[PDB]
Symmetry: C5
Subunit: 396 residues, 5 copies
């Protein structure tokens, strides 16, 4: 209308967009800063960045942009674009991204009394420290440090308001716990003026239903097939072909983990310890299997039991496991044939007890390795904090 | 011409590109918003974004850009570039992308009576929630929330017009169902002015011919080779080398699925349940195979049938399966040789019935596992909604 | 010089860069549009885009930028940068890229009589439909739709000139066939003015020397090793270890194809059909091998030939394949030993004919599967159109 | 100072940044163009681009930017930013990148006599043709075509100066040979004015120490294990399990090569021919191994030597290889037992000579395949040009 | 306030942002340059770049921007944005990135006496030379060359101040050692004016806890399973199936290393030498295993010991290893049977000593290969400098 056009011509008369809008150049300008988290787009572990879509809320006052509604009965609010009125230069300190602002400057609301409101939307890529420890059951605390870059505490008194999460669109993978905030003022090497800033800590918990179903459960079940080697009879030449196949094919899990873990030499992830533990157990099974196989094909008449394994694996362990173990010329020739058969029976008896001694080790190590696996998987997986919370919330 | 040059010099005289073009600063300016979907470029499941190429249709009126054709007989339409006339700041709220506008401002058509038309093309990357449940047979609903960012309901009365799909260039992978739209006005924490907005919901159905031919059909056929272990004779030492090879090599399918599924701990995909089901069936085959192998190489004269498997696998299951199962010195020596052979025949008879008992388990488990596989694959795959529609449209 | 400086000061006097340069505001301005393809950078199949480096040729006339050489003896051509003279807004409609123009505005040549020439270089990423059918032997037709965005047929009469390929720098992978063009005028929902546009169809043929040497030839040779299972004697326990190794290791080819094929559920690629065909043939070999192995270890005295395979695999197929197949006490004991040996010979004879019956199946299936493979590979590979052209141009 | 401020106010008085700085508008303006290569960042083979970090050296004269030092005793050089003085529009023609200039306009040095110097730094991504032939031992020639885009030969006489490599920071992977340059003037379809341009050809040699240690040497050593199959005794059922394991696991090398080779159907890389050659040799070993295994388990009394292999593999090849190869009732029964044993010895003798005949083939093919491998690896690897230079410079 | 608005109108009166702010145009302007490292974002080995987030500290003086506080009692500091006051053009020389500045120009602090301070934040991607030698235990020295691009030593006297690391946010993967700096002045081909510059060398040490736990430790343990082949009895046909499985499956480690090592043909990485060493040791085990297997299945009556291995592996090595090794017609027939058995015993005795001779080689090579592995792994891993420091800091 005619009044709005007239008002706009009067507000920008002798207006300098470089000066602070204070009426007295001795008191700081109070700027109220806030934040609104809209969603957590992606939390990259390798690059240790946090990509979020948030809004900002800057609110200050302007002494020069003032008018009364009596002279302009229709207009109660005017809007100035970027570059025509003074705005604070509050920006993210971390800003792990190519261009450093990431604010998408929009129009600036102006009151009927000079109060100024500014709501810029942007996608921020801050740099926070991802702690890969108790990795499937970890809680992350990523900081968001906001503050003015050129105005000190004597010019721009930056206040703070509580963060707003009214509308969050849950990410699904990360469970938001909260977002508390602080205002603190520090000192720097450039200047004696304190520089106040506001830091919003984003606390979020990882939902462990996905990884524990794709990395933990399959690892337990597949590693259980290595315990099945001790049930194969030694006659079927497949004991080594089963133990070595499972062991060397279970490596694919850590190749998946290597694509998720940052190469940080600071803390060993729990999933790495548990994956490392299940390799040694399977690896030791192959070592024990070889010990069994050399008792089976012992090639008798080339040694004897040292009477020490005679009482251990045949007397004590065998029961506790409950396994329970011219005619003279013609006469000389037929006697030799019978004597040859008798010696073969004695050789078969010695070879028979060696085979049973290899069966005791299979049954003994089946129970020894079974208890080793269950108390190790439980011990590692329960060792993490808030593990009972993680399974009571996602699984149950 | 001379008239067009004269008209352009008159329209921008005392024209302010910051004021609303209304003639009375008390009524809202009606802006008609529409949309035209041109193609769905890509639907990323991992990042949960939607990249589309669409046009926009903004249509309002301007009180100041008015003239009569009598004075200017030749010109009936003038065009102003970005930054010289007032335009609404309607933008996508979600805008999961670095720069937030994505509109590629073009020329603005101007009527002979002041009506304004604006048709900006752009490629929009919105953030919608991808629901990975019944994944090969899922229907997605992605929102497109458009609305003014600085003008409230009392200044910019944003109306809505139906979306246009006259020319869609079908994507091939995604089948478009429709695109309905709404206009709603909400309240926010900044202001008491309601902020109307228009939301276009993009409903699209995934064509399941590709994945079901590259992930479902090959999985069924390859998993059928694990059922072939029960047909191998136990003499060929390859029963374990066949069951363990198929099981550990079928893992490559989920490595492909892991590259498509977002790491969302909210719902288990159907293709994950069906892939998990076909691993346990194959995994249980190896466990059963080991049970068979220890009946084959039973090493007789070290145990006896407990008369419980004597009647089950040899009497009941065997029939229902229909398998149907100085001379004295010389005399003493030859008698021993015959007696040795007689004992060997008795040992061979006992070992023979153990081998047949292992054949009954192969035939029994062949039928038990075959019915387990067919009713599980059908049960999981039919469990999804609109599955009959998905196969009647893409396959048939 | 002094004349060029004087001329430049006269041309921009009272010049408006927003008006059409026509002298009468009732006739359209003729704009001649052309194109020059310089190289095809990349044809992405997954994203269905076409990245090309081309030049543009816009040619119109300007009524105001006119002067005579008599007054300015030295200058015959002036050049204006972007934003100082009127230029048409012709742009690519498809433009599957973030920023939509992709033209890199340069200087604009100006005649001595007002004729205007404009040659902008740019790298265009258009969206065309990639048809993955007869994939190694396919010909693609990608469109390039150019036209004005704000001027209709009554204001900007867009003409067309033939595309120029004088200098093409052949891509090596794609063989260019031609690039014909059209001009057509359509109607839209906004306006009653027809909007003429020019479409250049890029026709290109894929050279099939690379893929057919890295995907087709190796697949044929490796799949031929599955036919080698029928030559192994059954005594060497490696028949299953050879058939199952080749089958499960040939999967790597489709993992390579999956990285090239777009996930389009519209047409099955020929290379997918041929790769699927060679899996079933190899897969059926393992099924047949198991049938052979159970004839070898038949465990006689537990069944007999049903006299149906007695005449087929032993009488008909065996010939057409041409394989050609106190003294009394002592007397009783030695008689038993001889009788025991006689029964063993009868048991060995029955087991011998079972082994030969397994050899007939190996020789019979060797010829049955060999003819199955050759007529299937030839049948699928010849089924594609312009296949003889593809091998006569690239291979020969 | 006061003189520099005064001089700057005088130089931009009545100065037009659009006119050529010549004093007479009839002679071309001489522009001296040069180049300085600073490093070769990356040479991508798949996309056929060349990313280099180079400087430019443009040097012309300006008639209007002239002054005497007597009036301004302090200043001898002034600097104008981009957009205030006339600069040539020399740009890279190839420019395989999104934005086409890639020059990062900086300040422009100005002489005390009008001579102008301009040194813009930039990272250029040009499109050159990568020839993958003799791939580990190839030399590439990438062009850099620079020239004006809007000024012809009658306006901007573009000269050339030799390229400067004083400071190159060697890349490590690519060995620079030289960078010669040319100036040539061509004709185009737009205009009759010749357009001179300068082309700098970047000649560079690939260092072959890396690939030949990670692709060539490991391939030779691993392929040598396939020759070890002929030393295994046939009793150990692992001949097929060794030949088929090496063959199907050596495929990983070409999967690495496929990630480096562009999909160009123009020339077969040498490393592809050598990798293809070592597959056929290993593949033929498995075929020969099967021929051996059917001589070992020949199942005698089912055939006889055709007297042709009797003299070849047992008489000629065996020596040149130097391998050197009531009482009557009782009497009848014992005679049968002895006769049964005698027939078994005759059957064992026939089976023994079949096994030795399989040993001759192992020893014969061990020498036949060994000479096949050495003369093929040497023949392919020496076939490339400048191969002796490549090994005398990098290895030795 | 009124004074700040008045002051801003006076400072930009007759102010030229192109002239140097010196009062006498004969002395250079002293500019103090510094740097503050905030974190090391990523050190890419393949592309040889260094992405860091740092601040800059430029400090000079301005003669024209001076005023007294007496006239303006309130304001003591004014701030000018980019493009309104003179600023030096100091920029990174290396700048391995698309856009070359990477400085994110901010406001410029102005003193009450003319001293100027400028603190631009930016993320810099410099190009330094990554030396992949002693790769897990390497220390890198990356340069940061800063200097003016258009002002020489006679105009801009660039000084230097020590780098500041007060607040570093340790990266976790890289351990910072220090960041010393230099100022040097060189000569170039353009000009006779020396161009001073400041170079900051970033010295950083890689923490070796991650790789040595994921690449070194697993390689040692897995390679130890190849030494387990010498403990398997030869009767179980799995010696080759174990040696060849470990060898061909250990290749996955270098596929991981190939994704980290730049393709530089300048220095062989230590981890590559150690991975190459552990392949030959495992590869030689398979060669030795084949030698053992041909002693086991020696097929006697086809050769004899040459009396050279009779004393080595049976007399010397066997002890040092301590292994310790009508009646006439009836009479003729039974005599033949006994004689046949006697010849079999003599054939079994000869075959028995061949099998034991194969056991000596297993025990001899078990000790020979065990000492080969330990002294090779230790020798290679200790060969690197500062290896004891790397394990005393990260592991211990
Ligand atoms: C390669 O590493 C894996 C291994 C796996 O086992 C073999 C799985 N299997 C899996 O996750 N199955 C289920 C079950 C439910 C419920 O959901 N998913 C996945 C990966 Cl990635
Ligand atoms: C690795 O996972 C796969 C496994 C597969 O089986 C082995 C296939 N095979 C396939 O898809 N064959 C056909 C048939 C038709 C018709 O089209 N394609 C593909 C993948 Cl990706
Ligand atoms: C594929 O190459 C690997 C091989 C591996 O062994 C099989 C591992 N295993 C591993 O790292 N285990 C541990 C132990 C601790 C403590 O932390 N991690 C990893 C990779 Cl990448």
């Amino acid at each position: 209308g005619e009044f709005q056009r007239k008002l706009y011509k009067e507000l920008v008369k002798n207006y300098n967009p470089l000066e602070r809008p204070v009426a007295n150049d001795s008191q700081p300008l109070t700027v109220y800063f806030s934040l609104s988290l809209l969603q957590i787009m992606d939390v990259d572990e390798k690059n240790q960045v946090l990509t979020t879509n948030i809004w900002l809320q800057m609110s200050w006052t302007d002494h020069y942009l003032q008018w009364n509604v009596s002279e302009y009965p229709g207009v109660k609010t005017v809007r100035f674009p970027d570059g025509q009125i003074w705005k604070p230069d509050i920006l993210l300190y971390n800003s792990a991204d190519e261009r450093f602002d990431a604010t998408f400057h929009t129009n600036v609301l102006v009151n009927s009394s000079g109060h100024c409101q500014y709501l810029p939307p942007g996608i921020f890529k801050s740099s926070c420290y991802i702690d890969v420890r108790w990795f499937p059951f970890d809680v992350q605390h990523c900081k968001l440090k906001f503050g003015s870059w050129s105005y000190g505490g004597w010019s721009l008194d930056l206040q703070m308001q509580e963060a707003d999460i009214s509308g969050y669109i849950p990410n699904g993978e990360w469970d938001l716990v909260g977002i508390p905030g602080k205002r603190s003022e520090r000192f720097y090497e450039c200047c004696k003026e304190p520089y106040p800033d506001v830091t919003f800590t984003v606390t979020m918990r990882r939902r462990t239903l996905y990884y524990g179903l794709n990395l933990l459960i399959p690892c337990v079940l597949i590693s259980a097939l290595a315990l099945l080697v001790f049930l194969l009879p030694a006659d079927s030449g497949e004991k080594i072909s089963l133990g070595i196949t499972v062991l060397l094919s279970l490596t694919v899990f850590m190749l998946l983990v290597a694509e998720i873990m940052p190469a940080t030499s600071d803390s060993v992830p729990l999933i790495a310890q548990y994956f490392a533990s299940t390799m040694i157990i399977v690896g030791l099974s192959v070592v024990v299997t070889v010990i069994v196989l050399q008792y089976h094909h012992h090639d008798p008449d080339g040694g004897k039991m040292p009477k020490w394994t005679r009482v251990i694996l045949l007397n004590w362990c065998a029961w506790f496991l409950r396994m329970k173990r011219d005619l003279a010329k013609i006469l000389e020739e037929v006697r030799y044939i019978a004597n040859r058969f008798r010696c073969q029976d004695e050789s078969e008896a010695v070879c028979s007890e060696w085979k049973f001694a290899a069966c005791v080790v299979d049954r003994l190590c089946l129970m020894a390795f079974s208890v080793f696996t269950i108390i190790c998987t439980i011990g590692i997986l329960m060792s993490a904090p808030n593990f009972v919370e993680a399974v009571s919330k996602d699984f149950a």
